[PDB]
């Protein structure tokens, strides 16, 4: 980075202005799509043998049909009775 900054700094045209955008991307995971990653492997492995083009293709294919497990669930309680119970994710729509 020290080397990169130095070159891109000195390469600035005389009279011009060099500006650095301290940058962050929002919803990086939520927005980045598997099918685009599939395209990338296909385009990158263009010269590779047909088996290895396919081998790579699988990982993005699994991620484009992937299923998210919802973890433990939600805990419901009565303050009066002093009772608590974990509602498992399968039984989420078991209660109104």
């Amino acid at each position: 980075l020290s080397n990169a900054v130095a070159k891109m700094l000195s390469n600035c045209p005389p009279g011009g202005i060099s500006m650095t955008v301290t940058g962050d991307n929002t919803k990086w995971n939520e927005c980045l799509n598997p099918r685009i990653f599939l395209a990338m492997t296909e385009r990158i492995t263009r010269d590779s043998p047909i088996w290895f083009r396919d081998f790579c293709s699988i990982a993005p294919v699994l991620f484009s049909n992937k299923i998210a497990r919802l973890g433990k669930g939600f805990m419901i309680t009565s303050k009066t009775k002093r009772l608590k119970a974990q509602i498992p994710c399968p039984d989420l729509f078991s209660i109104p």
Partner: protein, 144 residues
């Protein structure tokens, strides 16, 4: 929240039902370009490719140069490679377990479905068994 948001940024995309899982699939790719600065998942394949073509022109042969090494590595890569990844989801018990155990439980289970590719020791023939295991009409596994 993640599950909602992921679909909140893809909702204007192509929605369909998977005839494999039966799941509600949403596809934003090649979708309508954004009207505002709310997060957008609607990436355009052509633009992704053009970007990579420029990258390949700027870095000639890099793609095949990498692909070669990545491929030659895979051929040398053994199965035990998978036994160095902390807690991994084990499908036999549907709980997280140590990478080393999660694998063992999969190898033991595969053998019962006549899948011994593991035994060859290379990663490729074990991986072959994983994408074959999807074709099995029923999958058997030990449970104590």
């Amino acid at each position: 929240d993640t599950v909602i948001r992921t679909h909140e940024y893809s909702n204007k995309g192509k929605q369909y039902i998977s005839d494999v899982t039966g799941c509600t699939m949403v596809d934003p790719t090649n979708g309508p370009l954004p009207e505002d600065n709310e997060p957008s998942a609607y990436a355009q394949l052509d633009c992704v490719l053009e970007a990579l073509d420029r990258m390949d022109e700027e870095h000639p042969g890099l793609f095949q140069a990498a692909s070669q090494n990545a491929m030659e590595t895979l051929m040398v890569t053994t199965v035990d490679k998978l036994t160095q990844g902390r807690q991994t989801f084990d499908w036999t018990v549907c709980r997280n377990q140590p990478a080393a155990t999660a694998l063992n439980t999969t190898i033991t289970s595969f053998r019962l479905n006549d899948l011994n590719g593991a035994d060859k020791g290379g990663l490729i023939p074990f991986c072959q068994d994983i994408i074959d295991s999807l074709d099995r009409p029923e999958m058997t596994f030990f449970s104590v």
